[PDB]
Amino acid sequence: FSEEQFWEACAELQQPALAGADWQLLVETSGISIYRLLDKKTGLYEYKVFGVLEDCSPTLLADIYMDSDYRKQWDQYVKELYEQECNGETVVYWEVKYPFPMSNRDYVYLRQRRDLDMEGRKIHVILARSTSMPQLGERSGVIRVKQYKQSLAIESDGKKGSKVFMYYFDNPGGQIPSWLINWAAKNGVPNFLKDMARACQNY
Ligand SMILES: CCCCC/C=C\C/C=C\C/C=C\C/C=C\CCCC(=O)O[C@H](COC(=O)CCCCCCCCCCCCCCC)COP(=O)(O)OCC[N+](C)(C)C
């Protein structure tokens, strides 16, 4: 990915930009808000996530976000996850546990972190994008996510936390049901965010 992309992801870290389209708020918990935008022609959603995470340093947060070995230990929604280098770049394989009776979703993607200093500010940017390799074909019974792009930008809130901004889009390869969106919004994601906070405490 080009440097532009790294500097572009930081754009809304300071002032969230949700006035361009119909961004509807989905969940507000642990000082984190998650907004979604629907594309009515396709049925697909985009997501943006902003807030702060008090009681977890920004540098350590960037570290737990890229530490897959640790991720597997504390995150109960990771079925399988491992990294490899293909052409000098880190390719990640990630299988997400979906609730019964839906199939699990798996991701093959490029991932790259850059620690910046813009306007004297410590910021950490993580970019992720969908790729394919012949050596890692599709698994029967696991939906391969073939369109997927994510950004994350971490910063200090000022006292003793991390200010964050994340953009997320994928095509999940099937009709994500309303009960699953409801489950994720009201239980899944809140429980995940607190598990993740706990994960900073025990690094
Ligand atoms: C900002 C820094 C603080 C940490 C991140 C903050 C907040 C993350 C929470 C939501 C982010 C917003 C929207 C994304 C919506 C769905 C995500 C899909 C499953 C997933 O991967 O989500 C984990 C997050 O884990 C979970 O929430 C576990 C609970 C869900 C697991 C199963 C869900 C089934 C499908 C749900 C569909 C409806 C979703 C509606 C959204 C409320 C992402 O983590 P990651 O950034 O490390 O990337 C992992 C690498 N990967 C993506 C390639 C697999």
Numbering used by the authors: 8 to 210
Excerpt from the paper describing this PDB structure:
The titular member of this family, phosphatidylcholine transfer protein (PC-TP a.k.a STARD2), specifically binds and transfers phosphatidylcholine (PC) generated in the endoplasmic reticulum throughout the cell to modulate plasma membrane, lipid, and thermal homeostasis. Steroidogenic acute regulatory lipid transport (START/STARd) domain-containing proteins bind and transport glycerophospholipids, ceramides, and sterols. The STARD2 subfamily, containing STARD2, 7, and 10, bind glycerophospholipids species. We demonstrate that PC-TP interacts directly with PPARδ to suppress its transcriptional activity, using a combination of cellular assays and binding assays with purified proteins.
C 2.18 Å structure of PC-TP in complex with PC 36:4 (PAPC) used to design proposed mutations to alter PC-TP PC binding. PC-TP adopted the expected STARd fold consisting of nine antiparallel beta sheets with four alpha helices. Our structure revealed clear electron density to guide the modeling of the bound ligand. The PC (16:0/20:4) phosphate group is coordinated by Tyr72, Arg78, and Gln157. Whereas the quaternary ammonium on the choline head group is stabilized by an aromatic cage consisting of Trp101, Tyr114, Tyr116, and Tyr155. E This structure suggests PC-TP selectivity for PCs is driven via aromatic residues that form a cage surrounding the choline head group (shown in melon) and residues that coordinate the phosphate backbone (shown in baby blue) (cutoff of 3.5 Å). Using this structure, we designed mutations to reduce phospholipid binding (R78E, R78A, and Y114R). Mutating Arg78 to glutamic acid (R78E) introduces a charge repulsion with the lipid phosphate group that would displace PL binding, where mutation of Arg78 to alanine (R78A) may have a more subtle effect by neutralizing the charge rather than introducing charge repulsion. We also mutated Y114 to an arginine to disfavor PC binding through charge repulsion. Protein complementation assays in Huh7 cells, Y114R, R78E, and R120H all decrease the interaction between PC-TP and PPARδ by ~45% relative to wild-type PC-TP.
